[PDB]
Design a protein around this ligand. Sequence first.
Ligand code: NAG
Ligand code: NAG
Lengths: 399, 395
Amino acid sequence: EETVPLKTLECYNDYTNRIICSWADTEDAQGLINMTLLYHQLDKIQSVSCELSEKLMWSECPSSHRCVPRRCVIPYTRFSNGDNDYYSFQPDRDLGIQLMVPLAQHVQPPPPKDIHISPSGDHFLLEWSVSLGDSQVSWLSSKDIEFEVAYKRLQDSWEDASSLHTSNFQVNLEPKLFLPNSIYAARVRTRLSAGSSLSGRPSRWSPEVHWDSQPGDKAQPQNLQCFFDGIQSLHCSWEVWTQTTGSVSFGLFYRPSPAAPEEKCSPVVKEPQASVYTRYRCSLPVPEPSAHSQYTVSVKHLEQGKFIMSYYHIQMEPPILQQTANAASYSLHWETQKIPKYIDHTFQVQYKKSKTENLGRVNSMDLPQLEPDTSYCARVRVKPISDYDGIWSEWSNEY
Amino acid sequence: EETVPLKTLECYNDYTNRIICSWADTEDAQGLINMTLLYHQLDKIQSVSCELSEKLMWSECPSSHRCVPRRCVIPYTRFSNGDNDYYSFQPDRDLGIQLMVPLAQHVQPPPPKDIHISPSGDHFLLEWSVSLGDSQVSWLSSKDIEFEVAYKRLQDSWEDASSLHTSNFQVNLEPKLFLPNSIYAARVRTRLSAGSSLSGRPSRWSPEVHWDSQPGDKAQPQNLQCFFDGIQSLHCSWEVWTQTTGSVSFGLFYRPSPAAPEEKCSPVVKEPQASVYTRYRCSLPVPEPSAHSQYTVSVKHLEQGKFIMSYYHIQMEPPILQQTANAASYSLHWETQKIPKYIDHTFQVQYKKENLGRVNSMDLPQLEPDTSYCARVRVKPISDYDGIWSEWSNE
Ligand SMILES: *[C@@H]1O[C@H](CO)[C@@H](O)[C@H](O)[C@H]1NC(C)=O
Ligand SMILES: *[C@@H]1O[C@H](CO)[C@@H](O)[C@H](O)[C@H]1NC(C)=O
């Protein structure tokens, strides 16, 4: 803990009259403060007139710093064997600071600790402990002490968070104080009674405690918060559970007064977001704020749909197959039909053992020849065409 | 942004009797919400009955998602060229949310902005603006608005920060609201005057803005503060300018009542701490605190110095020479005198790169090649008195 100039001191007597001393100060520090040397002989005080060499005569500056050299001579007409020398350092300007601290108005109580989060039931049990030692009466007790607990959900900063005050050493937390599907954090600090004489800083913030809020519907949007900027705009925000947003789309509808036609807010903005909840905000103009105006705002699901008509057609059909080679096997026939009656067909056939041909709307088609192996295989389909559209029917019977 | 069921919906038809449709919901959603499919016709609406499919018949799943297909059939005998087929998805539950907001009581004023940090010679000016609109009567103007500024040192957390309340669009920040050479930050928000009928939330914070406070001694330590933990202890903390600790040590002292003798509080603990400052802390005890007990705490410079006496000495010690190279080569003379006379002397001569007595002359064996030079000596005390070996002489 030794200061620089004192370690850099060696002072050696020349024995005629004088004493010569060599010391140093740091080279960043000479700018901030200068030092004067004190020579102590019985009662004298006596500040030493100092000068600065280019190098420490008798010592080495600590190599971390680089040093500033000093060379001082103290003329001493007479020594003795009993002369007694002490060299001390002090600053040339009297610096230091002093504070009056009335104990009453400077009390900062001890923090709470041993802090446990437990559910007992529908409720949530926040507990803490505080060490006042003893005596039971020493300067503070159950009075004048009180407590402040702050809870918030993780994504929130503490700066804005709700707060409770109990003289009790535990507080019961129930929902409606909480947004269902999120992680919450709580911490306690010890506060002085507003209702007491004693003044000062609140206790250190306790360590945090984390827990998951009661479960919730998850499909439903939550956190509907709408606020008015006092000039012709109202800003509403809400949260939906992220996994829902593929299933449902939401939008925000307002009516001024519970009379006016419902009106749709745009735009709706999507906060990015990686969180388990996804936040949404929309700002709606409010052009004629009445004195007492009650806007009524709701989050309803947007509409999702399409026209399919038809124009869209599938069906399906069987051939009857009366042979496999080694004989005269003529044509093929398709039974059902499922008879459409309005609209054209363009039936399709295939054969052998990817080999096909295109056809008209004909209840049967003729085969050129096969011979060895077996008449097999041949399959059919039907695709509505011309006026009407659709998709090929699933394949039939055989292979 | 269209839901995965609307993307995945393909209804296709077999004109005889029924229609069949294929669609999906997100994998994730499966535990969460049951969607239903609606067949829109004319007057009817009529929710489709659907069941779960192994695969999506006519559609690929949306590129991002993975999905869970449904297959739905509907018994429709009657058709037409004019027929209008519309299918729409909706959750089966009534799920949705409705909130009334009387404007008067939920108001979040426009935040401060275009905020400037302004120094004067002595004071500190703090500027901003607020956009309040027109007509000059809209619902709030000079009132029901108020203000709150927080300022803190760059190193502090805003959680603990000093706050101020004005009705005005600027403030003059007295120094002595501010520690000396150091860097402060500040922000402002708009609030509602207590007098207001309007209720709401204080506005968002204006942006932070940064400046460095009045210059100061800097050799002096600032920011002494002490707290009484209400049982038997008082905790103090102070800063110094870090590169001062090379020149000076400080310590913490206390007087319970001024009349009382100064005690030195120990140990003094130093925080590292990364900055231009270095923070120190020390906690000192208490007696029974008197109800009004007044304590006095000071940081002074700790005593710094070391003893010498003599018991330390140094000197210089000339020889004269008889000659060099081939005339008389033995002994040497010493001078000066320079008379200590109280103490042992033990001068020492060397040619070799030899401890001698209080004697002022040495003799040597010699050689007589070459030339005698160079020959050195030294002067010091042993026994009762002591010092550093003197510098060699004239050689
Ligand atoms: C040290 O002394 C010189 C003149 O003797 C002066 O210019 C300088 O400012 C002093 N240093 C400090 C830190 O005051
Ligand atoms: C709605 O979803 C639940 C999920 O638990 C499912 O069991 C139920 O069958 C669905 N509703 C109907 C009417 O099938």
